[PDB]
């Protein structure tokens, strides 16, 4: 019945492990 | 002004009154005299010949739309023809003077087509809810017909019609539903004296007056004044209405279409008796005789002679006078023929059974027909029945009865035309003339509109029997020879008087003005003469301005002398006394209204009330009638009330005949049927107007003798007998027998029904009375009590419906009296109205209202509800005073030295006096008397003014004081209104930081922002709640403990709602004062109080040092005007109350700014706009608006909004919620720069301002509650707060405030707002909170400390002043012990309870781990039970958010009117379903609001705000169900709700896909992302910009801001180590060491869109055990650059295990980091 509403350069890196959690499908 | 008599200028004898002089005959008739009287033949006029290219137009040849409402029809008749251009292609006013019978019904569908086809929508649909059109008839049997053919015709539109007839209430129902609304013109203008067309009055587009030239008949009050109202309504709110008038051809049309306001040379149409459709000759019949029984002789053999010229070949109907003469004349015809020659051979004409078959078949009938039948005859009047009548019409179409004789009704109630129609008397019984009467000229015409069918007759005579002392008349009136007239001369004061209580006429002007559009108006224009004006007068004044003055001032001088209306021979301006307000609503003259007042009196009998009402002048005219005298003789010993007094005069025969109805005793004369129906449809009004008149003066007896004969009068009953007699289902010798027994009707309650059946010894149906008796209504009342003051108390009552509602005996709602009644019962202390409506049966309904008492206390006070339309369904409660004990009486106030006005030069140090040079030179008294205690001396003060006296200098005096002891010094001042704070923290920043260069910080949310702000500023604006949260743990803090100043300011709200929170703070400072051994100044702001000794010995103030002053020490005298409205509807009243506000405007405050506070901010919108379309409507336009245009275009350019944008323009601005702060910052800089003059502003935005004016109004004094379902009054302090705007000091000399509110509030205002009011703490409800805090932080170690600490609050100084309002009984100490010992064992008892405490040996107590969770996020306790109680190791993000939204935070939360609808539209929007929930609970709303803001998508804009309010409460709920999760040692469901806040702020749900955090992001930017092979932030951290870019569409910003945000999101990398994870064993503590470092450093909060308030990235570190859902530990903690984090715990049994590292964020989604290690 309503609309919905919608809301320079950086590399920065460094070597790392960079692990995040699984999103399981919640 | 001079006195003119009104009874010599109007002229009398009503319609038959003539304008004709001579009524010259056509060249086509003549008269012809027999033996006693004459006829006088006018044959049928030849039809106009039609004109050159003169055609009817096809059906087919209108618009399509018009098509439908058409059909069986070829084509349009020669007048529709000429009309249907007028009709259908312009909105033109129109006026249409066709004969009778020409179709002038089918003119006024082609105009009501026309609206219709204003809104043809799409798809062949109509807008049913935009439009309604009123169809005003002068007979309501011409009504019913009007409804069905129109309901007929209009079918196929899918638009409703239906008649006005009924109560008001089912009026409003009625016309709501409908579209065309068909009525009398009484019936109209008595809904719209009664306000039942305001809500409506909007969408009435078209207004159609048939038979308009009715006028003439007496009738012409009634519609004139509808006339003018509408017209004069048109040209004071601009809208347009169009008029639709249908006339006869008669003289002086032209008059009538001016006054209609139509256009002579477009609008108007007449025709004469030649357009007439059918032709038809006129016979007239005039009869000489003079004695009564020849002259009825002769009339029957008239009629016979002239039956038997259409004997044979032509359909004669014949009209009769009364219902009972129809058969009598159709036998007296039928004997006539038959006995002479049998006549009836061919006047039947069976010709061998070719036609009579049909009747012979149908002669099967009940009735008189049956003999009629036969022979041809038939009767047709109303009653007979349903079936006969449309039995007796079918068979007259198909020329069956050759002759029928039917009453008047035949002509308006069915289309049934005939050859030959004959009009048989002329002669009628008027009761309102009390006497025999000629019937109306109207009746007459539309009668011999019937004559001759339209396609089967060439031309068909019609004739007309009367006497030939009229016969003129009716020439005159057929001829078209007789103008119209104006009768407004007569009934003048009663429409001047209904003009006055609508409010259309303020002053005497406003009246001169309104007889302008008076048709007599135009009359005495055009026939001065004729009205009593000389010619010479004529030319002295050429539009009579002075004459119509004369006029009104005799009748205000009349009304005045009756006391209807207040009149000033002075000014000229009206004054509505309510009395004349029920007047106006009743129909009431003004002699009735000036025997009522020397007639009624406290101590009226029953008898006397009966005798009282006889009097009535309604009745004046009427009479005794000889030959039904003896009649009434057994009438009078039969009725039960005795009447005295009487000897058979008017009065005696009005009350025996009211008797006789309420008793339903039957009559065997015509001529009383007449007057019984006519007195008893009177007596309905007069006694509902009786009992107002008494209900207002309060007159205990009377009021409910008068409302117990109203309810008699409307259900035909006595109270004697049995009440079950109001469900017509029962068998009458059932309650017969009831009552033969004397057994009272209560006793039925407690009988079951095999007992009642028993009883009355019918078991068979003793169920079933049974189900009657838990029918009757009834309530159960309980009140509770409180002394507000030594002479009022405030009672609560509570009602609990007792009774089965049933739809059908009691319908949409029931009404009901509260009465309050003093110990002798003579008089009524405080009446109000109440409304169990039926969706909220069976639900405790709960009525708070002050009542007085005096010094000698009576024993009881009686509390009675008594059913507004039912008998005997009363319930008494009596109210004991036998242990109330009054509150102390309070000493003066301080009174006001005169002391010499202080300079600013007092003040020693120059910086200081700096600070207020500029301003003003010299301090007002007020300050001036308080300057030397506060500035000159160190002790705890308290100062008592009336707002806008400048108390916040006394509080900068102290500041100084303090600054100047010390150089860097700490002062806290707490406010208890957020608004208010900001205001004093930008002020005070203007003034001491800027000047005397001196912190000045304001308190916010976080807890660590507070510290530093109290470690680093020396000023410390806060509100109680935020000031609480740091001053709970004291004993920790420092910087609490040292500060020199501690200043509260609106002190008097500690008796309101969030007072607890300020009197706990104050008293804890008080007690950190005591305890620190180093003073701390308390310096306390209020209204002016008149327990002020109480608050200063609360707060240590000495008796020296205490200054307590009247509210009539004001600098700037205030004057208050409380105006009372008698409306019960909300809606109803401030549609009533629009306009006066307007004109309290212009008589108060012309030229001078305007406040005016309205209820809601809905309400907002409507009432700018309602005041300034009057504004437009009055002489003088955009008044409000002082500058120019030029100047306000660069203002308005920055307004977003439309309506606000045309209000400004004209000078009017309003402000609420939903304004943007620059908005209203814009709006407020313009008022205050006078750019223009009124303001309306919700009321909840009144502590929100910044700007005074002149005037303040306030709208309505209630608001709508929807967790209650009710409308509750404002706080006094709130009120009290609007009322302190009015003070302008430097320019205005006096302040004026207007308060409107309903009548029953208006005596409450009077006795508070004047005088200094009490405060009462209500500590005791809200104390759990309290005391569980101080439990945790170790303040409260027993019950003995707890009541040691009960003794610091200012609820321990009320209770021994005031017991009774906190349930004590008495006043010694042991009472006072006995309580506190009893509260706080009830308060320790609900803590443990919840296991927020632990009690031990029933002394000491502990604080438990609930409680400290529930302290430490400053929750209620209830939600850390709820929590602790709903959640389980398995819930998920469904349960949380369901949890969580049944929070106790929300239950403040409003439920505005109207938002169900809304509310059940989104429910199924939302991806998870409720189940079943009821749409007015809070919680519910949250939850709905929570799952839609979550989804992204957006509702409108007023429900907006709520979801800003819930998020903003929402993040510590949470973070309190993590750490109760945690401390339940469950992981799944601590990962799911640090998950839920995660997607809370970042508004996106679990399933959605990360990228929608990112700015400027859709879904189909999110599917080119996807196939890509882009799914997380971190990879666009990694992406080489040109393709983030050439993947991306972008601009400047989206590119840039979106990379930005990028920077923003936290990349954060982490390594942890297991200490000694080699030597470790089984039981042995584990520690854990976790390295947390951010390369990037972090700039600023947050990154935040949609989440409203500004947050800060939360970490929680956890180490679980997947496998078995158990959660080891959990450690919360910020990140600022780099942490080292220790995590313990203790190790299991058998060594090995595997933990998991979970790393979760509160505020960005996708950077919870796993880390996998094993033990041993």
């Not at chain 2, 309501?140 to 196929?156: D, H, I, P, Y």
């Not at chain 2, 019937?450 to 009229?470: F, M, N, V």
């Not at chain 2, 040079?917 to 500035?935: A, L």
């Not at chain 2, 803590?1391 to 400290?1412: F, H, R, T, Y």
Request: neutral net charge; charged residues 25%.
């Amino acid at each position: 019945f309503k609309e919905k509403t919608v809301t320079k350069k950086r590399r920065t890196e460094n070597g790392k492990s960079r692990n995040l959690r699984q999103r399981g499908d919640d | 002004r001079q006195v003119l008599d009104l009874e010599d200028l109007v002229f009398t004898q009503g319609s038959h009154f003539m304008a004709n002089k001579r009524c010259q005959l056509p060249d086509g008739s003549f008269r012809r005299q027999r033996k006693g009287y004459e006829e006088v033949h006018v044959p049928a006029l030849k039809p106009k010949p039609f004109g050159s290219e003169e055609q009817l137009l096809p059906v087919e040849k209108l618009p399509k739309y018009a098509q439908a409402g058409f059909e069986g029809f070829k084509t349009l008749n020669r007048i529709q023809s000429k009309l249907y251009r007028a009709a259908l292609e312009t909105d033109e006013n129109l006026l249409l003077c066709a004969p009778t019978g020409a179709g002038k019904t089918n003119v006024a569908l082609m105009c009501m087509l026309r609206e219709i086809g204003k809104h043809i929508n799409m798809d062949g649909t109509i807008n049913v809810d935009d439009f309604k059109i009123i169809y005003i008839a002068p007979m309501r049997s011409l009504v019913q017909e009007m409804v069905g053919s129109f309901g007929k015709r209009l079918a196929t539109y899918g638009i409703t019609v239906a008649e006005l007839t009924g109560d008001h209430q089912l009026c409003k129902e009625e016309i709501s539903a409908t579209q065309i609304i068909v009525c009398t013109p009484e019936k109209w203008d008595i809904i719209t004296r009664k306000g039942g067309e305001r809500t409506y009055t909007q969408l009435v587009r078209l207004i159609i007056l048939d038979e308009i030239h009715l006028l003439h008949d007496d009738r012409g009050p009634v519609l004139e004044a509808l006339v003018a109202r509408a017209i004069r309504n048109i040209e004071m709110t601009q809208e347009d209405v169009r008029l639709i008038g249908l006339s006869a051809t008669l003289p002086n049309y032209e008059d009538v279409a001016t006054f209609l306001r139509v256009d002579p040379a477009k609008g108007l149409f007449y025709f004469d008796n030649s357009f007439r459709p059918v032709p038809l000759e006129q016979t007239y019949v005039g009869i000489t005789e003079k004695k009564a029984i020849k002259r009825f002789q002769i009339m029957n053999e008239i009629v016979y002679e002239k039956i038997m010229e259409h004997a044979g070949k032509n359909q004669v109907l014949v009209f009769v006078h009364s219902r009972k003469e129809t058969g009598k004349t159709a036998r007296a015809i039928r004997d006539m023929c038959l006995e002479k020659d049998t006549l009836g051979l061919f006047l039947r004409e069976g010709s061998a059974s070719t036609e009579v078959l049909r009747t012979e078949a149908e002669q099967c009938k009940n009735l008189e027909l049956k003999d009629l039948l036969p022979y041809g005859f038939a009767i047709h009047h109303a009653g007979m029945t349903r079936v006969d009548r449309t039995l007796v019409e079918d068979l007259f179409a198909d020329k069956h009865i050759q002759v029928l004789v039917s009453t008047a009704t035949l002509a308006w109630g069915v289309n049934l035309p005939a050859h030959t129609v004959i009009i048989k008397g002329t002669q009628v019984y008027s009761p309102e003339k009390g006497r025999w009467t000629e019937l109306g000229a109207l009746d007459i015409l539309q009668m011999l509109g019937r004559a001759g069918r339209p396609q089967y007759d060439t031309k068909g005579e019609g004739i007309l029997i009367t006497s030939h002392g009229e016969l003129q008349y009716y020439l005159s009136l057929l001829n078209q020879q007789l103008p119209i007239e104006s009768q407004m001369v007569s009934k003048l004061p009663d429409m001047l008087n209904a003009e006055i209580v609508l409010g259309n006429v303020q002053n005497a002007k406003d009246a001169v003005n309104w007889l302008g559009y008076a048709y007599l108006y135009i009359r005495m224009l055009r026939s001065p003469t004729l009205y009593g004006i000389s010619h010479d007068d004529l030319k002295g004044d050429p539009l009579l301005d002075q004459r119509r003055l004369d006029l009104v001032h005799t009748a205000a001088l009349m009304l005045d002398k009756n006391n209807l209306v207040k009149y000033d021979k002075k000014t000229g301006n009206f004054q509505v006394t309510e009395l004349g307000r029920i007047a106006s609503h009743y129909y009431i003259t003004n002699d009735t209204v000036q025997t009522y007042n020397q007639l009624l009196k406290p101590t009226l009998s029953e008898i006397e009330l009966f005798r009282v009402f006889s009097l009535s002048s309604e009745f004046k005219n009427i009479t005794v009638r000889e030959e039904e005298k003896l009649e009434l003789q057994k009438l009078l010993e039969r009725v039960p009330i005795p009447v005295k007094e009487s000897i058979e005069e008017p009065s005696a025969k009005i009350n025996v005949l009211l008797q006789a109805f309420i008793s339903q005793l039957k009559l065997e004369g015509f001529a009383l049927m007449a007057d019984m129906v006519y007195v008893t449809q009177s007596a309905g009004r007069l006694m509902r107007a009786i009992f107002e008149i008494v209900l207002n003066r309060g007159w205990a007896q009377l009021t409910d003798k008068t409302l117990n004969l109203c309810k008699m009068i409307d259900k035909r009953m006595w109270q004697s007998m049995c009440p079950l007699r109001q469900f017509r289902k029962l068998p009458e010798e059932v309650v017969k027998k009831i009552e033969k027994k004397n057994f009272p009707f209560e006793r039925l309650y407690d009988l079951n029904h095999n007992e009642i059946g028993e009883l009355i010894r019918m078991p068979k149906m003793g169920k079933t009375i049974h189900k009657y008796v838990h029918l009757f209504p009834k309530l159960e009342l309980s009140v509770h009590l409180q002394p507000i003051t030594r002479s009022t108390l405030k009672v609560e009552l509570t009602i609990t419906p007792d009774f089965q509602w049933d739809e059908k005996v009691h319908g949409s709602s029931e009404a009901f009296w509260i009465l309050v009644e003093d110990v002798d019962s003579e008089v009524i202390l405080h009446h109000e109205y109440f409304l169990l409506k039926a969706k909220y049966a069976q639900d405790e309904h709960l009525i708070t209202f002050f009542v007085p008492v005096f010094e000698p206390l009576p024993p009881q006070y009686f509390i009675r509800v008594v059913s507004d339309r039912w008998l005997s369904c009363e319930t008494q409660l009596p109210v004991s005073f036998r242990h109330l004990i009054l509150p102390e009486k309070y000493p003066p106030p301080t009174e006001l030295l005169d002391l010499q006005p202080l300079p600013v030069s007092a003040l020693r140090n120059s910086a200081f006096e700096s600070l207020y040079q500029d301003k003003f030179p010299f301090f007002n008294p007020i300050q001036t008397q308080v300057f030397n205690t506060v500035y000159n001396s160190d002790d705890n003060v308290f100062v008592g003014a009336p707002t806008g006296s400048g108390k916040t200098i006394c509080a900068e005096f102290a500041i100084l004081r303090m600054l100047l002891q010390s150089s860097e010094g700490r002062c806290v001042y707490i406010t208890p209104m957020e608004a208010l704070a900001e205001q004093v923290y930008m002020d005070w920043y203007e003034k001491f930081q800027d000047r005397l260069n001196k912190k000045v910080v304001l308190l916010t949310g976080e807890t660590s922002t507070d510290l530093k702000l109290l470690g680093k500023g020396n000023i410390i604006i806060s509100t109680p709640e935020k000031w609480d949260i740091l001053s709970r743990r004291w004993k920790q803090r420092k910087n609490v403990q040292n500060i020199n100043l501690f200043v509260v300011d609106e002190v008097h709200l500690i008796g309101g709602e969030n007072g607890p929170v300020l009197e706990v703070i104050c008293s804890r400072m008080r007690y950190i004062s005591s305890q620190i051994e180093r003073p701390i100044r308390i310096v306390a702001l209020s209204s002016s109080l008149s327990n002020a000794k109480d608050v200063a010995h609360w707060l240590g103030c000495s008796a020296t040092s205490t200054f307590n002053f009247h509210p009539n020490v004001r600098p700037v005298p205030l004057e208050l005007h409380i105006q009372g409205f008698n409306i019960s509807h909300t809606q109803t009243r401030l549609l009533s109350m629009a306009k006066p506000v307007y004109h309290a405007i212009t008589k108060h405050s012309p030229k001078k700014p305007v406040i005016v506070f309205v209820p809601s901010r809905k309400q907002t919108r409507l009432t700018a706009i309602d005041i300034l379309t009057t504004c437009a409507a009055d002489i003088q336009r955009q008044r409000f608006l002082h500058c120019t245009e030029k100047d306000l275009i660069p203002y308005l350019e920055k307004l977003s909004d439309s309506t606000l944008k045309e209000t400004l323009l004209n000078g009017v601005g309003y402000l609420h919620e939903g304004l943007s702060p620059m908005e209203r910052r814009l709006v407020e800089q313009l008022f205050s720069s006078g750019a223009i003059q009124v303001v309306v502003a919700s009321r909840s935005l009144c502590w929100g301002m910044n700007v005074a004016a002149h005037l303040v109004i306030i709208m309505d004094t209630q608001y709508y509650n929807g967790k209650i379902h009710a409308y509750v009054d404002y706080p006094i302090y709130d009120v009290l707060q609007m009322v302190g705007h009015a003070n302008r000091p430097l320019q205005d000399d006096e302040g004026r405030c207007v308060i409107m509110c309903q009548g029953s509030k208006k005596d409450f205002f009077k006795k508070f707002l004047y005088e200094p009011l009490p405060v009462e703490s209500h500590l005791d409800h809200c104390m759990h909170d309290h005391f569980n805090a101080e439990i945790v932080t170790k303040t409260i170690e027993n019950k003995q400390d707890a009541v040691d600490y009960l003794t610091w609050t200012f609820l321990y100084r009320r209770m021994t002043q005031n017991p009774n309002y906190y349930n004590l009984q008495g006043i010694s100490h042991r009472h006072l012990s006995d309580h506190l010992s009893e509260l706080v064992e009830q308060t320790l008892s609900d803590l443990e309870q919840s296991k927020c405490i632990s009690i031990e040996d029933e002394m000491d107590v502990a604080p438990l781990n609930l409680g400290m969770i529930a302290a430490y996020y400053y929750i209620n306790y209830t939600t850390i039970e709820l929590f602790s109680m709903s959640l389980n190791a398995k819930t998920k993000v469904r349960g949380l958010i369901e949890i969580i939204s049944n929070a106790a935070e929300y239950e403040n939360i409003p439920i505005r009117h109207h938002e169900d609808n809304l509310l059940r539209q989104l429910a199924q929007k939302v991806p998870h379903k409720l189940n079943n929930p009821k749409f007015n609970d809070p919680h519910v709303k949250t939850n709905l609001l929570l799952q839609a803001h979550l989804s992204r998508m957006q509702l409108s804009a007023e429900l907006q705000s709520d979801t800003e309010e819930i998020l903003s409460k929402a993040i510590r709920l949470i973070q309190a169900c993590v750490d109760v999760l945690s401390s339940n040692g469950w992981l799944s469901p601590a990962l799911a709700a640090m998950e839920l806040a995660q997607m809370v702020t970042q508004a996106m749900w679990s399933k959605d896909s990360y990228l929608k955090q990112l700015p400027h992001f859709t879904s189909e930017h999110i599917k080119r992302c996807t196939d890509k092979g882009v799914e997380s932030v971190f990879d666009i951290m990694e992406m080489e910009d040109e393709e983030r870019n050439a993947l991306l569409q972008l601009t400047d910003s989206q590119i840039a801001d979106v990379a930005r945000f990028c920077n923003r999101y936290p990349n954060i990398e982490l390594s942890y180590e297991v200490v000694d994870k080699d030597s470790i064993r089984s039981g042995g503590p584990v520690v854990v060491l976790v390295q947390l470092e951010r390369e990037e450093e972090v700039t600023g909060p947050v990154i935040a869109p949609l989440f409203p308030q500004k947050r800060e990235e939360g970490w929680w570190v956890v180490i679980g055990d997947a496998k078995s859902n158990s959660l080891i530990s959990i450690k919360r903690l910020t990140l600022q650059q780099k942490a080292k984090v220790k995590l313990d715990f203790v190790a299991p049994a058998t060594g090995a295990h595997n933990y998991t590292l979970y790393f979760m964020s509160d505020a960005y989604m996708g950077c919870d980091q796993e880390y996998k290690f094993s033990v041993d």
